[PDB]
Design a protein around this ligand. Sequence first.
Ligand SMILES: [Mg+2]
Ligand SMILES: [Mg+2]
Length: 253
Amino acid sequence: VEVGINRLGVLRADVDNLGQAFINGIPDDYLSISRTATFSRAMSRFFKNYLNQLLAEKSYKINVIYAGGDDLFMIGAWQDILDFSIVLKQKFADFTQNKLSISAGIGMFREKYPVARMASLTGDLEDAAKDYKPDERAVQATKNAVTLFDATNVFSWDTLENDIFVKLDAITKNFEKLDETGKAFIYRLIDLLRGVNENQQINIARLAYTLSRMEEKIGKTFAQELYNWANADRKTLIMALEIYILKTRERAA
RNA sequence: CUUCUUCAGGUUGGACAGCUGG
Ligand SMILES: [Mg+2]
Ligand SMILES: [Mg+2]
């Protein structure tokens, strides 16, 4: 890879409540050993065979360690892993036609990072995604989520795809003609957005000033769009901005 | 043989504003 940060991507996906589906997912009337075997074979053949075939469809830079049953462990270029996470979610949702959900954790590590710690950390992220519960009123976690590089960046799959990826696409399409001072301006935007929690007024003013400085190579309309996002959807905006910085980092790859 | 030693009127306007390269 030529553009991005020289980082390995570790993906760990797991179907939510597959054991519950095997216990009581099938209605009691349609319970037989043949139906149970059909469901088991569907799941197993999907994971093993179809993950192989789907990753062979386009030359993803992935190095699948294990697919097996209900689980997944793949290591590759972090951009390819991030791109294939949504493809995996969509293909699983098609295959099950939205009867089972999948949780994933995506870790980002350097090449010489310990493999034991890669596995442990990405498992922790996958557990955090399985801990996803948007409202503290329901019973049992929603579990249909993905964790992005850190246990604080747990987003649902719909949230991830729609919000984060449309924001990342807009940022990419509006930030490609920035200067090398613009990169530092994006860094400052990220720092200000992270600090907004402990600085309500001065920090939003500083963000407005930074957008003012930027709105000469990005346009006034997108500066206003970023300002609106910062006051409405901040954590998604921070996620998209960090992903853009890591994807466009010119420190080899 | 005379007094005025200066009085009156204008008192800034328009233009450019950061661009390239790593
Ligand atoms: Mg599971
Ligand atoms: Mg499992």
